[PDB]
From Swiss-Prot, chains A, B, C:
PTM characteristics: The initiator methionine is partially removed. When isolated from culture filtrate isoelectric focusing gives 3 bands, none of which are glycosylated.
Species assigned in the record: Mycobacterium tuberculosis (strain ATCC 25618 / H37Rv)
Disruption phenotype: A single enc deletion survives less well after 3 days in 2.5 mM H2O2, pH 4.5 (mimics growth in the phagolysosome). A double dyp-enc deletion mutant cannot produce encapsulin nanocompartments, cells are highly sensitive to H2O2 at pH 4.5, mutants exhibit significant dysregulation of redox homeostasis, survive less well in C57BL/6 mouse-derived bone marrow cells and are more sensitive to pyrazinamide treatment in infected BALB/C mice.
PANTHER family: PEPTIDASE U56 FAMILY, TYPE 1 ENCAPSULIN SHELL PROTEIN
Gene label: enc
Protein name, UniProt field: Type 1 encapsulin shell protein
Signal sequence extent: none
Length: 265, 265, 265
């Protein structure tokens, strides 16, 4: 019996399949960082830190001895608990196809948002500097007029060219910026079909981020280290509800400070 | 994991066998309708209604269109919860053969009584008209003298003959009437051995019904549609007790209004 | 002999083939909902209701019993009668290729219109809430200027994105709106070639609907349950005319309230 204790949950195998389907769908839908960073195989429940290869100076234990600590980054475990109604769980076996999986969707969306805020915007208590703060290229400003956004994206591509970084390049846009370039048009084409012609990679919807990011997807610059991937576990239950959670263990490392350009408002 | 959640119940496999034995025995003992009606195979947890073949007039959605709804009868799920002592459940594995399965017996008896009241006497909220109300033959009256009951049963058999219905005929007697014909005698034989000689079918003990019924068991007149048959499920438990329930999904349909005669007091 | 009684109709096999060809062509031409909803296999003439998996509270038949009705949606049978001239039926065997099948076309068009009004706009006597009323996304308004319609369709696509729903997306346009975007142009292209570039699914002509619909065609959101598909039956005939009808039995269910956006004027 794993530490998730799913066998103790008053949930049927049909309801489990529906919950796992909904969570996987929502997480894959709302996650943007995994499309552009390198994602490693999960290390297991035992892995607790990632080796940086660096040495930290420490006071010698005795004279004539030289001492260093090995430098590492800790993995952070993120848990999002949600509550399900047992009536909706019972309905699944009776053939219901409209069960309320809305809390599962909220939990998967919140987990995806936490992972993408962590990669792009950082999480300092976990010692994760984000792609924005680690970026060495100058930061550009997005204008209010959506028809001007293709100019600044070409400016960011020029900053990436000057840094000696080659493509393919992808653009990650905030939900607000993605809506503005999608609902605004010039020459009979959305301002976001203009962006699709500037780059050889994708234009990514990133509802978690601020502003925008232009970065290369050549590989070897951004590293998402997974301890365990997203899993559903069982917490508690009463007559009416079941208490579950979503969970993942990970840390993020970035090696190239000039592989990305960050944009803001 | 089924929606019964029997794996979460603090009940051993020996105690489960004893409980299932007791419930099956009591239900088979106290059920009378299944001996005379046609009982179908269970349709499963998904089946929710039985097609009648009829059409209901509905207002047309537009001019030059004719509309009908299909007519159907809903299946009703009946649940009888009961409570067991965990000490008696523990005693079974230690070799005890006198465990208190009295609540299981009460629950099985109540479920059997609900099923037989539903078939014979109806359940109007479920849209089940009983065999008594759907009967088109005239209703006869049982007398107080038990030695006169064989005369009225022969009168009912004559009413079934006049209706053009052929046997084999069975008589279902109320618990009171079954006790009166069993504990009263003429010519050195119980008044109920007299009834056994009037009919080519059985005399049925029916502790749920009022009065008596005389009906044919030729087939194709009374139909018990089973969604799921009697199953034991697990609700809850604490340190002292386990909370279980008996459950079944079904509806009843009758096609011949002259296949039965109902008797009362 | 089926209940359609086509063997009693004074119609030849050549005329039958021509009538069946014309009806199939017109129905496939004027039907839009079947292009975007899931259409099941016909259940047969016996199927009368579709199980929802839900339970309805009903008053207990006796104390210590818990009762629920199974919840289901009835199938509605729609019949459109039409009249054919027997002279035109006779002409077919003599080699005529211009027989008046106009009533067959009117009947097929009316049946298709009833099916699409039912899916999108509902039919409350059949207990069918339409895609418009079941939609949980906000409703958008179509402007009078046809050159502005691509902006509102991109707004609806943004509402579907915010709901967490992924494509492929299709747009269904009213006959009026489809004519307006087809007969109006900007940059040398119809305003409807602009719409074809916004979406990865189709732009559907829907002559039955009001306004427009933007919805996902990923599957598992809209369900058209067929009892019997469109069939031609024989009603009556005299010296001059034959009386036929078109017929189908179905109901519609929708499971995702955020899978569609409805537009109006």
């Amino acid at each position: 019996m794993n530490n998730l204790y799913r066998d103790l949950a008053p949930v049927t195998e049909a309801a489990w399949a529906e919950i796992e389907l909904e969570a996987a769908r929502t997480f894959k839908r709302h996650i943007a960082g995994r499309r552009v960073v390198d994602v490693s195989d999960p290390g297991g429940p035992v892995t607790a830190a990632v080796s940086t290869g660096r040495l930290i100076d420490v006071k010698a234990p005795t004279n004539g001895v030289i001492a260093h600590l090995r430098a590492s980054k800790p993995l952070v475990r993120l848990r999002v608990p949600f509550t399900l109604s047992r009536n909706e769980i019972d309905d699944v076996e009776r053939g219901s196809k409209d069960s309320d999986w809305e809390p599962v969707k909220e939990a998967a969306k919140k987990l995806a948002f936490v992972e993408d805020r962590t990669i792009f915007e950082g999480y300092s208590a976990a010692s994760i500097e984000g792609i924005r703060s680690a970026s060495s290229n100058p930061a550009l400003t997005l204008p209010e007029d959506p028809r001007e956004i293709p100019d600044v994206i070409s400016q960011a591509l020029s900053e990436l060219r000057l840094a000696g970084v080659d493509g393919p390049y992808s653009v990650l846009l905030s939900a607000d910026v993605y809506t503005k370039v999608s609902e605004t048009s010039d020459h009979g084409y959305p301002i976001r079909e203009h962006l699709n012609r500037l780059v050889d990679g994708d234009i990514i919807w990133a509802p978690a981020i601020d502003g925008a990011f232009v970065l290369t997807t050549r590989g070897g610059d951004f590293d998402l280290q997974l301890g365990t991937d997203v899993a559903i576990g069982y917490a508690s239950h009463d007559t009416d509800t079941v208490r579950l959670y979503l969970q993942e263990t990970l840390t993020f490392l970035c090696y190239t400070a000039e592989a990305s350009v960050a944009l803001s408002h």
